Design a protein around this ligand. Sequence first.
Ligand SMILES: Cc1cc2nc3c(=O)[nH]c(=O)nc-3n(C[C@H](O)[C@H](O)[C@H](O)COP(=O)(O)OP(=O)(O)OC[C@H]3O[C@@H](n4cnc5c(N)ncnc54)[C@H](O)[C@@H]3O)c2cc1C
Ligand SMILES: Nc1nc(=O)c2c([nH]1)NC[C@@H]1CN(c3ccc(C(=O)N[C@@H](CCC(=O)O)C(=O)O)cc3)CN21
Length: 482
Amino acid sequence: SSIASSLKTAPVIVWFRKDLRLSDNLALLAAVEHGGPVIPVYIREKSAGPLGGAQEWWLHHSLAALSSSLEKAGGRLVLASGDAERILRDLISETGADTVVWNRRYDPTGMATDKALKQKLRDDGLTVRSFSGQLLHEPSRLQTKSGGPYRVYTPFWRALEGSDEPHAPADPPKSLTAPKVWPKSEKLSNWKLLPTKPDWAKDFSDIWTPGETGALDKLDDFIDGALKGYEEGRDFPAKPATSLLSPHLAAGEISPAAVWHATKGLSRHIASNDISRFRKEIVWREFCYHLLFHFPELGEKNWNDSFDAFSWRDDEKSFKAWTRGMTGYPIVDAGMRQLWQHGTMHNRVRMIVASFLIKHLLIDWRKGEKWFRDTLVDADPASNAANWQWVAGSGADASPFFRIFNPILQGEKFDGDGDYVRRFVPELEKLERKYIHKPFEAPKDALKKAGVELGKTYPLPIVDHGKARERALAAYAAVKKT
Ligand SMILES: Cc1cc2nc3c(=O)[nH]c(=O)nc-3n(C[C@H](O)[C@H](O)[C@H](O)COP(=O)(O)OP(=O)(O)OC[C@H]3O[C@@H](n4cnc5c(N)ncnc54)[C@H](O)[C@@H]3O)c2cc1C
Ligand SMILES: Nc1nc(=O)c2c([nH]1)NC[C@@H]1CN(c3ccc(C(=O)N[C@@H](CCC(=O)O)C(=O)O)cc3)CN21
């Protein structure tokens, strides 16, 4: 190291955010190609990070898993809290790194943070490079054949379906070059991301294994499992027919290109309709990000400003009943209880509970959006906002506001035998399917036999369907006169 000294390569910093994976990670691969020591860092920023309590549980386990995977490769994960610029400059100064890399994040606030930071670092002569991976498409570049943003799903789907296959996923690096001396790291346990007493996430582990290995296990199981019959099965919440990839995708533990490529070459065993339908759902995520790019206020302002003057009820009591799954409408209650217990909800039931809040209770959709932000492990700044707005009646793909279905009928249509309701509202277990979705219409004899006392065992409906419907349509008529 004195007289036969090779000229050494400077380190490179890899800044992880919602891309907590080693596979199909172009930033990490760039760091490997760069040579020299690789310095992985995760920063607890003020603005960005987990959208709520459930996602903090997710993040803890995700960071623990990523750290373990990096250590297996010979690296480590540096943890730091505070101002990203100050932290990165301090790491640069300490290590002598000449480059910072990251994977692009496409939520407008995070993208703006990155743009500003990138310019500041470049102005001081640092190399900064950002990479695709979070999305199959580039929202700032993709336009209709006539030069517009996509406003409607089907043409957007046809564009992505018709595009050259997303590039196949890149392998993870098996080894990372480490610095001789590691920068100091914060302790994950000190970040207070986990519940303590009570452990309200105690059943999350029954469903979830956060991190890249868990993501790949979910993908593998889906391809070898529920992908078969997915198209027919996905509408029925009692059936475990979906992939459960959403929080892994949200956390960037698996790329959508990896998911897409996993659906290729399956014709010997899998019907094309199931694959097409699953791909469409992946593209719904893409579309939500497209809309967020084109309308950054998607989570706070109505897409259709005709709704701005809508007069929402000031009824925090009904809102609380909704959050607790105590509406007296079993399918709604089942969904809200599923969410509380497992940090997720079947998509059909998300639509039903969202509609119940907005139309039956006439409560501001933003309140429902915020509740979901705190309780979903998959909370996503594009998909949550976009879906709430569609249920609320804004957007080309929105159901018109005046379309108001009875939760009872939706329950009987998509959960006819009542298995989903019985799973999450077990106090109704003994009711026959005739009354499982409408226990308030059952006769005294049946309620007695099933061990159900309305108002004790299970609540009466907090609103009458007919009256709620009249109220919502009157509110719709009023907003038109504005
Ligand atoms: C009111 C409301 C709020 C929602 N909030 C979120 C959210 O915060 N995060 C989130 O990822 N999804 C959200 N969704 C969409 C959808 O309900 C979930 O993606 C789905 O329940 C996830 O289960 P899965 O992974 O088994 O889906 P699968 O059926 O296996 O679908 C595969 C993937 O496609 C994507 N996807 C599927 N459906 C949709 C959709 N309607 N919109 C956008 N992406 C979709 C997801 O990434 C999902 O993992 C919301 C839907 C509604 C109606
Ligand atoms: N999906 C999901 N499920 C949840 O249960 C959940 C979320 N998400 N997101 C965050 C909130 C907050 N969590 C909490 C936090 C504290 C208490 C708690 O301290 N409970 C006391 C009594 C006070 C009370 O219930 O408010 C207890 O020991 O029962 C309960 C739930 C549950 N949370």
